[PDB]
Design a binder for this molecule. Structure first.
Ligand code: HEM
Ligand SMILES: COc1cccc(OC)c1O
Length: 402
């Protein structure tokens, strides 16, 4: 118990979900590594500390308590050594840049057009549900082999898994404050199994181009497949973050550009600026804000704190990307910010494996949107509300045109 941080005792989970920025602005100044009682964990809040923990030889991957309750073992994000190496070898082939470039265009662009065609002549839309999330899940779902799971269902799954994974509040004793908050996630996993089990049955006997078929078969001895219980936790990882984050990234990018109308106009007139707009969007509101963690494997001193071996540290990358030691006025979206390293994809050997793919999905989606609707205007009838501490993004993005 750190005396000068006694105010952290009164920080609530709801506060952090609704708006973590004021608390984390204090943390970055007072204690870049600090134990947050309601989270039951140390959290790293600055760019220097997050990067150090994520790349340190004295830390390894771990899942948070709520995250482990949600995904089980072996979730690619929470394992190390030979298991992690196998899971990385499993997912990396379809994410290799040279491979992505072979097909990303023909994958994403027809999908973006299909969802645009449903509303581009309406003069109003809610872009999160009508465009950003559907493009994100349909693109990845087709790649995975889930062509027959409609986008409504994929979006419901990642929303349920998100809430379950981020169900992190703990009581004074150290147990979960909402032990009922995992039930929704359990139901999503059961629905996922009902859909994927027969697909796995088929792929074992009849492999095809779908990523999950390749997860079963790639690198295995002849006639063998990875056991479904061995790959399911990484399937869940995909059906949460991989499904959710590209849509949140493009939506937050749009919110940011709306907040700088001159910059929105710039990007519409010159869509070669879209990659830069997206990189700034991810820094400005990081889709994975504080979901992942590491655990120390030996005593280590971090930000003046002597940590024993076995100490978990939550990586609040969304706070690190507002580090005022790194950025000028980081709370503002600025397309013309000098390109600088950011931590929205994490760091170290557990950094995002899908960066190149994710950036193209978001790029192609915004290219088609601005081409279809050059005169997008935000519905200023209300402000944009963001939600989430673990994962963060706009809950809706109402716009008009014409
Ligand atoms: C813009 C959207 C995305 C963002 C912001 C993003 C950000 C991340 C972050 C922060 C992590 C954790 C890194 C750490 O703890 O240091 C991550 C891990 C990962 N992401 Fe991405 N991700 C994104 C889209 C994807 C997509 C679409 C895929 C799959 C196609 C993907 C596959 C991964 C995988 C497999 C891991 C686990 C890597 C490991 O633990 O070894 N991500 N992502
Ligand atoms: C906490 O859950 C996650 C963390 C990082 C990446 C994920 O999906 C790729 C993901 O589902």
């Amino acid at each position: 118990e750190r005396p000068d941080l006694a105010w952290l005792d009164e920080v609530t989970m709801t506060q952090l979900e609704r708006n973590p920025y004021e608390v984390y602005e204090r943390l970055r100044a007072e204690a870049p590594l600090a134990f947050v009682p309601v989270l039951g964990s140390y959290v790293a809040s600055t760019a220097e500390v997050c990067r150090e923990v994520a790349t340190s030889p004295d830390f390894e991957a771990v899942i948070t308590p709520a995250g482990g309750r949600t995904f089980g073992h072996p979730a690619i994000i929470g394992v190390n050594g030979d298991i992690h190496a196998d899971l990385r070898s499993m997912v990396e082939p379809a994410l290799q840049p040279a491979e992505v470039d072979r097909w990303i265009d023909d994958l994403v662009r027809p999908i973006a057009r299909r969802y645009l065609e449903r509303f581009e002549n309406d003069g109003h839309a809610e872009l999160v549900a009508q465009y950003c999330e559907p493009v994100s899940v349909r693109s990845l779902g087709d790649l995975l082999g889930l062509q027959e799971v409609d986008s409504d269902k994929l979006r419901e799954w990642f929303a349920k898994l998100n809430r379950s994974f981020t169900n992190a509040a703990v009581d004074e004793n150290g147990e979960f404050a909402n032990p009922e908050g995992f039930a929704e996630g359990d139901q999503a996993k059961a629905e996922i199994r009902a859909v994927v089990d027969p697909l796995i049955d088929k792929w074992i006997e009849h492999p095809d181009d779908s990523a999950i078929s390749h997860w079963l078969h790639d690198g295995m001895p002849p006639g063998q497949t990875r056991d479904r219980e061995y790959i399911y936790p990484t399937i869940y990882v995909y059906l949460l973050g991989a499904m959710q984050e590209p849509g949140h990234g493009m939506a937050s990018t749009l919110v940011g550009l709306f907040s700088r109308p001159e910059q929105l106009e710039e990007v519409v007139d010159d869509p070669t600026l879209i990659p830069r707009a997206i990189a700034e969007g991810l820094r400005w509101t990081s889709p994975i804000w504080s979901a992942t963690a590491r655990i120390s494997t030996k005593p280590v001193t971090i930000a003046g704190v002597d940590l024993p071996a076995g100490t978990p540290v939550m990586l609040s990358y969304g706070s690190a990307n507002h580090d005022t030691g790194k950025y000028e006025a980081p709370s503002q979206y600025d397309l013309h910010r000098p390109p600088l390293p950011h931590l929205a994809f994490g760091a170290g050997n557990h950094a995002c494996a899908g960066i190149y793919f994710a950036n193209h999905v978001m790029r192609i989606a915004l290219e088609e949107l601005f081409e279809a609707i050059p005169n997008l205007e935000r519905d200023t009838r209300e402000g944009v509300e963001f939600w989430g501490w673990g994962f963060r993004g706009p809950t809706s993005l109402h716009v008009t045109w014409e």
